[PDB]
Amino acid sequence: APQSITTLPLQPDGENRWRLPAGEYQGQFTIEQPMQLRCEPGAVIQSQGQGSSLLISAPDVLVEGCTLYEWGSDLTAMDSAVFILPAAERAQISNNRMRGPGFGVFVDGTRDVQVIGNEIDGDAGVRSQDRGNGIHLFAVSGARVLHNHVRNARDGIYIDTSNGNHLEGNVIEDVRYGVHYMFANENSLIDNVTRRTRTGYALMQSRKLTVTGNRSEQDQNYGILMNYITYSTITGNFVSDVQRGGEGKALFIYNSLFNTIENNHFEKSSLGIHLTAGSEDNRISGNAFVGNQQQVKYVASRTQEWSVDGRGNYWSDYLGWDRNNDGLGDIAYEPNDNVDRLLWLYPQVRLLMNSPSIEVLRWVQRAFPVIKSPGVQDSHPLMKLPTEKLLT
Amino acid sequence: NAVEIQGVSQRYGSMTVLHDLNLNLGEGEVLGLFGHNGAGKTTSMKLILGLLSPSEGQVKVLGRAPNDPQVRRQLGYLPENVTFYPQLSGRETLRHFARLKGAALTQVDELLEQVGLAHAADRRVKTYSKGMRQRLGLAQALLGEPRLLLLDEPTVGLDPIATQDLYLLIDRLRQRGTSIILCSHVLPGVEAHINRAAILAKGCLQAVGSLSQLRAEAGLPVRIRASGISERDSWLQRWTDAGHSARGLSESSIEVVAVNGHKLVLLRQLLGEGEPEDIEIHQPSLEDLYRYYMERAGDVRAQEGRL
Amino acid sequence: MNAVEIQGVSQRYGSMTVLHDLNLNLGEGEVLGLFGHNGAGKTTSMKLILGLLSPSEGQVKVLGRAPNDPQVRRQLGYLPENVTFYPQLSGRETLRHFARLKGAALTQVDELLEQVGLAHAADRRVKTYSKGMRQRLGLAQALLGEPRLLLLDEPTVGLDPIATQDLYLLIDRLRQRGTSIILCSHVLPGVEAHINRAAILAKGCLQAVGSLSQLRAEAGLPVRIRASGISERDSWLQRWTDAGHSARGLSESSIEVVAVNGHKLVLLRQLLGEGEPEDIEIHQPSLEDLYRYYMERAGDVRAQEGRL
Amino acid sequence: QQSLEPVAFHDSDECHVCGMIITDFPGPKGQAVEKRGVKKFCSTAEMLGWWLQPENRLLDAKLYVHDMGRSVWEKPDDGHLIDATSAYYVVGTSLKGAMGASLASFAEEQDAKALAGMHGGRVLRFEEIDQALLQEAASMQHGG
Amino acid sequence: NQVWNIARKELSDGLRNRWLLAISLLFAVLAVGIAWLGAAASSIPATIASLASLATFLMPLIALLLAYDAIVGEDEGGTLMLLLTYPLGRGQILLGKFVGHGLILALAVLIGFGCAALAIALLVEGVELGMLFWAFGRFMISSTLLGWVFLAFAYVLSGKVNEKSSAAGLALGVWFLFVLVFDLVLLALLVLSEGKFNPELLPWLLLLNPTDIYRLINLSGFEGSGSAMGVLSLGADLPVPAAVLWLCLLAWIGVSLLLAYAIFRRR
Amino acid sequence: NQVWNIARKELSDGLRNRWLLAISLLFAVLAVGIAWLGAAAIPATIASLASLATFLMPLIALLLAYDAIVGEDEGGTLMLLLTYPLGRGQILLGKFVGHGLILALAVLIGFGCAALAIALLVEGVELGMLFWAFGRFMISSTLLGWVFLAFAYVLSGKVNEKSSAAGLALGVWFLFVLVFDLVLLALLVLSEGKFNPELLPWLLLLNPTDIYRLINLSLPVPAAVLWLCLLAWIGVSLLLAYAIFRRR
Ligand SMILES: [Cu+2]
Ligand SMILES: [Mg+2]
Ligand SMILES: [Zn+2]
């Protein structure tokens, strides 16, 4: 494992600032001194396929404009492209191109690391179980990962036990998970774009975090998966066309107790929102459930009001009126019948689902409200689209 | 004088379906009304019952107005076809009409035995034949001593023992002083029981009077046939001396169409020479008299087999 | 040659025999009348002639064949009572339907609509037909083709008295051609002028069969002679009563004699020799009175003064 | 009789709920044999969160968890895999499970009593597990 | 009186109708079944709006099953022309049929809501017997009036037609229009216009349907939720008090009986 | 052949039924109004059309033929027709041909205007699949109607009055459309999975309305058995109707 000083860097400025010229290199490299090294666009630092290509151990290093290629793939020894030690505090990794079968940016124990503007194309042939993470973050406080471009890695931007950090404006394409969260208390992520992913947003056991403005374009089987998230905030997310591959759920809420789910847009999926029985009584108001073949799946008999402060959600199949000209509807909207939960409770009713007796039983509930099980209704639903800005 | 129709010319739709019939009916007579082309048969039927208003003329039933309630308790109307109330029983149907007409309820048990229906009393009218409903329809017509029956074909769907017994019940009520009107289209058989016929056609009442008068006011041949004559060759000619064509169709079936002006000398021909077996003075019946008065007003004789 | 040869049938339903030992022979051109009261024999005999039932202890030979051959039923008209056809069909289309089934030519439909007098009410629905208007339609399907046997079960119910007498005028034109028909009626005056031979039958059996001259000769029934002023009622009331005949003492100027019509050959000679015959009416004992005699003769008791 | 066989875990075995790789985690891993198709779980608390849903109360399926009284806690072998209804789960320990609260499953109740006093937890049966307890125990583990 | 002597027939003829006794026992076994499901779910404003919906489907059905062949079933049966030759009027053989068929509906709903109350006082423990008697007393004297509306509707379509097979077609048309077409025409007028067709005229269209005036009477005190009502949420915008809603239910009888009498007077 | 001469009557008499033409117009209106609200708002709308034609094609079949045998016995023409050169088989089979081509025309105005409302209001429907999915739809809707036609001949031959035939034809329509599947649903909720899963698909073969939906939703059985089980509901119940009609 050689060092960065073993190359030929031409200094532009004598304040530990270096500039590597155009031309390829070979092998792993190590930064041990606080060097704000830049690179020409022809600086293809291509390792031979083993080891972490650019290991970083010194604080305050502004690595910029490098192009790394073909590092190792041993995920147990964490063969990354940019390994950042716990002593390498406040590192800037700006505008880099990476192509190799392991971790793109592996940091651990770091503070105030900035991973900005990189393009990390992961793999093509590995089975998405050994491709390595795009931007792996392991218990970092202060990080700023902004406007990257991760493609074809394994589980995108993995985050493990990292407390305070922002994920702003990065595009994540053709991965298993878009953004993975594990025990990340008081986190934040803004305006990320996830495309063609087997789960758009994994929210596992991370409390008190802000999920805002994110987009999920044509993901597979899970739009935003939230497991055990408490005191969170889901405001302004655009989840569109979650096709099957699960049957396709734009939001799957599993054991999330308290969180504010407002102003979202769940569009053209098979299930608009799946609410499990353990995750109840959280503020869900102002979303747009348009184009989904089934809006809410709620297999319970407990009532669940879905409108805080008298304002509810926009539903596309809401066949209601508005006499006094406010934004709210006049009749309440129950998204589920009693026969719409017999199909979920007993799957053999799928053979009887086109029968006239089921079409009779849908009308008997609208005429005789004693047989209506208490569902997932919202008093005062919206009449117009509240997310007029999220379609752009 | 039960039914006194005078000057009545019923118009509806400016069609004038009845015109100037003056039909006075006596207090013991049995009148018969027979209608073909003319609608008079039904309009006049209504007119006496009071459920129609006589335009340009007055109808006086039983000396009073035809729609008064005091005379409408004294009428009896057997309509054409009355399937009454199929879920009610026989007694409960007749007790219903006894309560409406004001008759005493003790008459119901002695009218379901007077008419032959006590075996089918307390049985539902849906389990009745057409003859049993005509028996029940008569039972409400005799309800509470009616002084004017008005029967519209009472013997349809009825077995011939009850038909003969119905006219014996009519002949009991004629002697009691109750005028009966037998409006029928079953003209053979009713001519033995009525007193005066009234053939009305195209609205205008063509002929009225007794059966002896309708043969006098209409020259019709009397059909004397003497079945079982001794000699037949001179009996082809011996009646034609005074203009009676002795036409025969069998070994001895000489149906001699006479003229009703030489009835002494043909029977002196019959009884002076030749022995009879069963003489049959066959008068021109009510079927034959009806087609004379009908043809005299508007009707033309139909062809060889063409009705 | 005989059209209907009912040869000793005995039709039973369960243990009860509803028609026992019926023995008919309808001729080649005769008009026979099946009259029944208590018995269901009349209805069953009608069914046996048709192909509707089977003789449980006999045989029937309709037109020299079995009654259920297709060659028989193409030459067998049958008008049933109280028939009401398909009311949304028209009057012409109903006969055009029935002409296709019997194999009759379709050029006979417009003849028979004209023949029964239904030319004005053809191409109108059967729901807007009267009762007698449907009897003209029901008669017209019986005349389809060239039938050799007609079973007119109550043909003149609800029919006009011109059309009733015209119908029997069509019968005597038909029986001259050789079509032996059968009347089934309950109105006994009216059929009696055209019935060739009555077939009055009781509960089970067949009581009497034969012509009207044979029924009046066998059943001794008194003649109903009514007169009006030959010489005097009271001078003529005495003469038939010593000779054993009933002279009814009516009100005024009317001589009603109920004589026993066996001695009346020489008894009428004195009536001619002392007065004019200018208003008399000798009535033979009618078919209504003959049928009332045969019911009383077997298993019946006369109803009261005026009861039924 | 196809529900009688607890199948072994593979490396390419995703959880039924969270969907991530099961064998990259410590702790006992429950699974549910359905006799029409086997579905597996990354933690026992994620299996018990799935079991208490009303789609699966009526579902005739055998539940199988690991026996941590006969296994090392970081890498449990497929091996001995007891029935989950007759187990003795300890709760509230500081051990790091995969998804939910740490519910170490045992079969002998004394080794379950060993880990309860060794970490400050309370042994409890399968029927005492409810959704008021799973959300309470995970908040005491991954909170504050 | 002659009006009672002809009411005694129809009281004893409708009770032998086996099609009546089937669907009036169906009204009894459903009003117990609704009140049992309203007792096991303990709720109160849902078992009132569902019982009033049960009598919306059945009390027009029992009324039109009785009286669709009241006039034309006697006219083609021959017994109407006979009845006018009795000492009667056309006003007595109509008001007598209304009294006779009206006491059947007064008994078919006293059985139905009577056994529904005994499936509440014997099922939910501690219910207010004063509030139970008042709510089910308002159900009894208003489901007769809904029944007497469709009784008087059936006399209109019996005097107008001249064939009983066509009276059953019109009685099926009246049952479909007033029960579950006017509730859907008003819904589709509100859905396609999004409540901006007329913000003040549309609550007055509830008074043009006696099944909707019936639902507005019984859902007065127990309003409860909004989605259980449906298009009856327009009834909160009706400025008429509760006493006028009784009077518009009685006016639906008296206009459609005077129309039924004026049609029958020129039969 | 006299099976056709009596079939031409039932076409001319059935097409003038005012009760039928009201329902067949309402079938064609509701098939357009479902197709209008299923395209602007094709397997998603052919399932809602299958639930529509399960309501009305039993109702159209029972409106035609509830008074086929007992309506002619009350009319008196049944006793007249047997004295013609006609068997009891040719009356029944000729009524079945005549009433069969009526509701074989009622789906050509029903779905002929529904497929017109799909081929002209989707603009990109891929019509090569349309003329095969509606060809399987119009054929299977006639065969559903031909079962209940043969059910109507069974109840017509058994009763003796026209009023009790409509009381049984309403009972057959309630039992075979919306009581047989409600007692399927009822057993499942009480059982709480006690009822065998495999047993329920086979039990749909005892219901011709259920076999109708299974050949419009394409399952342990293949497709070709359900076509031969729907035709077996015709052939058994017509043979049952002929056995009842020979015992009058
Ligand atoms: Cu995870
Ligand atoms: Mg509003
Ligand atoms: Zn898991």
Short mmCIF file of N, CA, C and O in Angstrom, two decimals, chain C residues 47 50 52 73-74 78 80 83-86 88-90 93 97-98 100-102 125 141, chain F residues 2 5-6 8-9 12-13 16 72 74-77 79-86 88:
data_model
loop_
_atom_site.label_atom_id
_atom_site.label_comp_id
_atom_site.label_asym_id
_atom_site.label_seq_id
_atom_site.Cartn_x
_atom_site.Cartn_y
_atom_site.Cartn_z
N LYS C 47 -110.35 -37.04 -24.67
CA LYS C 47 -108.92 -37.29 -24.64
C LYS C 47 -108.54 -38.58 -25.35
O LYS C 47 -107.51 -38.65 -26.02
N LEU C 50 -108.47 -38.26 -29.02
CA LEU C 50 -107.24 -37.59 -29.40
C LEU C 50 -106.08 -38.48 -28.97
O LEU C 50 -106.27 -39.60 -28.49
N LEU C 52 -104.15 -37.92 -26.46
CA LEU C 52 -103.70 -37.41 -25.18
C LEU C 52 -103.61 -38.50 -24.12
O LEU C 52 -102.74 -38.45 -23.26
N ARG C 73 -103.52 -37.23 -37.25
CA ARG C 73 -103.64 -35.88 -36.73
C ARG C 73 -103.46 -34.79 -37.77
O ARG C 73 -103.74 -33.63 -37.48
N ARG C 74 -103.03 -35.13 -38.98
CA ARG C 74 -103.06 -34.15 -40.05
C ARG C 74 -104.45 -33.98 -40.64
O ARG C 74 -104.68 -33.00 -41.36
N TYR C 78 -109.55 -29.97 -33.99
CA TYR C 78 -109.95 -30.01 -32.58
C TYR C 78 -109.94 -28.60 -32.04
O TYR C 78 -108.87 -28.02 -31.86
N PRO C 80 -110.55 -26.62 -28.73
CA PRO C 80 -110.79 -26.80 -27.30
C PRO C 80 -111.57 -25.62 -26.73
O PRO C 80 -111.62 -24.54 -27.31
N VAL C 83 -110.09 -21.44 -24.96
CA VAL C 83 -108.73 -21.27 -25.45
C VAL C 83 -108.45 -19.78 -25.60
O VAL C 83 -109.33 -18.98 -25.92
N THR C 84 -107.24 -19.39 -25.23
CA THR C 84 -106.76 -18.02 -25.40
C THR C 84 -105.36 -18.11 -25.97
O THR C 84 -104.43 -18.59 -25.32
N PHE C 85 -105.21 -17.69 -27.21
CA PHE C 85 -103.98 -17.88 -27.95
C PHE C 85 -102.91 -16.89 -27.51
O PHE C 85 -103.04 -16.20 -26.50
N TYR C 86 -101.83 -16.84 -28.26
CA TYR C 86 -100.68 -16.03 -27.92
C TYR C 86 -101.01 -14.57 -28.16
O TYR C 86 -101.15 -14.17 -29.32
N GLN C 88 -99.63 -11.57 -27.98
CA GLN C 88 -98.79 -10.63 -28.71
C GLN C 88 -98.66 -10.98 -30.18
O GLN C 88 -98.19 -10.14 -30.95
N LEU C 89 -99.04 -12.18 -30.57
CA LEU C 89 -99.08 -12.52 -31.98
C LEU C 89 -100.33 -11.93 -32.62
O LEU C 89 -101.26 -11.50 -31.95
N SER C 90 -100.33 -11.89 -33.95
CA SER C 90 -101.49 -11.36 -34.63
C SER C 90 -102.43 -12.49 -35.02
O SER C 90 -102.11 -13.67 -34.85
N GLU C 93 -100.97 -14.27 -38.11
CA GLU C 93 -99.74 -14.99 -37.81
C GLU C 93 -100.00 -16.22 -36.96
O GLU C 93 -99.19 -17.16 -37.00
N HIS C 97 -99.00 -19.76 -38.18
CA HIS C 97 -98.23 -20.66 -37.34
C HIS C 97 -98.85 -22.05 -37.32
O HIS C 97 -98.14 -23.05 -37.41
N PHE C 98 -100.17 -22.12 -37.20
CA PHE C 98 -100.84 -23.41 -37.11
C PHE C 98 -100.93 -24.11 -38.45
O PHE C 98 -101.10 -25.33 -38.48
N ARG C 100 -98.39 -24.17 -40.54
CA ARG C 100 -97.08 -24.79 -40.72
C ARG C 100 -96.96 -26.08 -39.95
O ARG C 100 -96.24 -26.99 -40.38
N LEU C 101 -97.65 -26.19 -38.82
CA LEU C 101 -97.55 -27.40 -38.01
C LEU C 101 -98.39 -28.53 -38.58
O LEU C 101 -97.94 -29.68 -38.61
N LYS C 102 -99.60 -28.24 -39.05
CA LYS C 102 -100.44 -29.28 -39.62
C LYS C 102 -100.07 -29.64 -41.05
O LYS C 102 -100.68 -30.54 -41.62
N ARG C 125 -103.67 -7.80 -32.88
CA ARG C 125 -103.19 -8.70 -31.84
C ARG C 125 -104.34 -9.52 -31.25
O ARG C 125 -105.51 -9.14 -31.32
N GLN C 141 -108.44 -22.77 -37.08
CA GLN C 141 -107.35 -23.74 -37.09
C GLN C 141 -107.85 -25.17 -37.16
O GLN C 141 -107.09 -26.05 -37.55
N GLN F 2 -90.42 -29.69 -37.63
CA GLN F 2 -91.33 -28.91 -36.82
C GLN F 2 -90.69 -28.38 -35.55
O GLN F 2 -91.37 -27.71 -34.77
N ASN F 5 -90.52 -24.86 -36.99
CA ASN F 5 -91.80 -24.21 -37.22
C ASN F 5 -92.41 -23.70 -35.93
O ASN F 5 -93.15 -22.71 -35.94
N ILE F 6 -92.10 -24.35 -34.81
CA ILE F 6 -92.50 -23.83 -33.51
C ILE F 6 -91.44 -22.91 -32.93
O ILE F 6 -91.71 -22.19 -31.96
N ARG F 8 -90.03 -20.48 -34.87
CA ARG F 8 -90.36 -19.20 -35.47
C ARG F 8 -91.51 -18.49 -34.77
O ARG F 8 -91.62 -17.27 -34.88
N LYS F 9 -92.37 -19.23 -34.08
CA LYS F 9 -93.38 -18.59 -33.24
C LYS F 9 -92.74 -17.88 -32.06
O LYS F 9 -93.07 -16.72 -31.78
N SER F 12 -91.14 -14.60 -32.83
CA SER F 12 -92.08 -13.53 -33.11
C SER F 12 -92.88 -13.15 -31.87
O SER F 12 -93.30 -12.00 -31.74
N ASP F 13 -93.10 -14.09 -30.96
CA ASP F 13 -93.82 -13.79 -29.74
C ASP F 13 -92.90 -13.26 -28.66
O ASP F 13 -93.32 -12.44 -27.84
N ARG F 16 -91.83 -9.38 -29.10
CA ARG F 16 -92.87 -8.39 -28.81
C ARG F 16 -93.21 -8.34 -27.34
O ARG F 16 -94.18 -7.68 -26.96
N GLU F 72 -98.71 -21.94 -21.51
CA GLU F 72 -99.52 -22.52 -22.58
C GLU F 72 -100.58 -23.46 -22.06
O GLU F 72 -101.59 -23.67 -22.73
N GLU F 74 -102.23 -22.88 -19.20
CA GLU F 74 -103.26 -21.95 -18.76
C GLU F 74 -103.94 -21.31 -19.95
O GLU F 74 -105.14 -21.03 -19.90
N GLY F 75 -103.21 -21.08 -21.04
CA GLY F 75 -103.80 -20.55 -22.25
C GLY F 75 -104.61 -21.56 -23.03
O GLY F 75 -105.34 -21.15 -23.95
N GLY F 76 -104.50 -22.84 -22.71
CA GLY F 76 -105.24 -23.88 -23.40
C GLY F 76 -104.64 -24.35 -24.69
O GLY F 76 -105.11 -25.34 -25.25
N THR F 77 -103.59 -23.70 -25.19
CA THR F 77 -102.96 -24.11 -26.43
C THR F 77 -102.06 -25.33 -26.26
O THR F 77 -101.69 -25.94 -27.27
N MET F 79 -102.81 -28.22 -24.69
CA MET F 79 -103.64 -29.36 -25.07
C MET F 79 -103.95 -29.36 -26.55
O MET F 79 -104.13 -30.43 -27.14
N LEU F 80 -104.01 -28.19 -27.18
CA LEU F 80 -104.22 -28.12 -28.61
C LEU F 80 -102.98 -28.55 -29.38
O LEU F 80 -103.09 -29.25 -30.39
N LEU F 81 -101.79 -28.17 -28.89
CA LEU F 81 -100.56 -28.43 -29.63
C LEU F 81 -100.20 -29.91 -29.62
O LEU F 81 -99.54 -30.38 -30.55
N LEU F 82 -100.61 -30.65 -28.60
CA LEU F 82 -100.31 -32.07 -28.56
C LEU F 82 -101.16 -32.88 -29.52
O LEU F 82 -100.77 -33.99 -29.87
N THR F 83 -102.30 -32.35 -29.95
CA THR F 83 -103.11 -33.03 -30.96
C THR F 83 -102.63 -32.76 -32.37
O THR F 83 -103.22 -33.29 -33.31
N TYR F 84 -101.62 -31.94 -32.53
CA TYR F 84 -101.00 -31.69 -33.82
C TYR F 84 -99.96 -32.76 -34.06
O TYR F 84 -99.61 -33.50 -33.15
N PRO F 85 -99.44 -32.91 -35.29
CA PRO F 85 -98.30 -33.83 -35.47
C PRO F 85 -97.02 -33.34 -34.83
O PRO F 85 -96.12 -32.85 -35.51
N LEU F 86 -96.92 -33.49 -33.51
CA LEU F 86 -95.85 -32.89 -32.74
C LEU F 86 -95.60 -33.74 -31.51
O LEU F 86 -96.54 -34.05 -30.78
N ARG F 88 -93.78 -34.22 -27.67
CA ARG F 88 -93.47 -33.33 -26.56
C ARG F 88 -92.02 -32.88 -26.58
O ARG F 88 -91.69 -31.85 -25.98
#
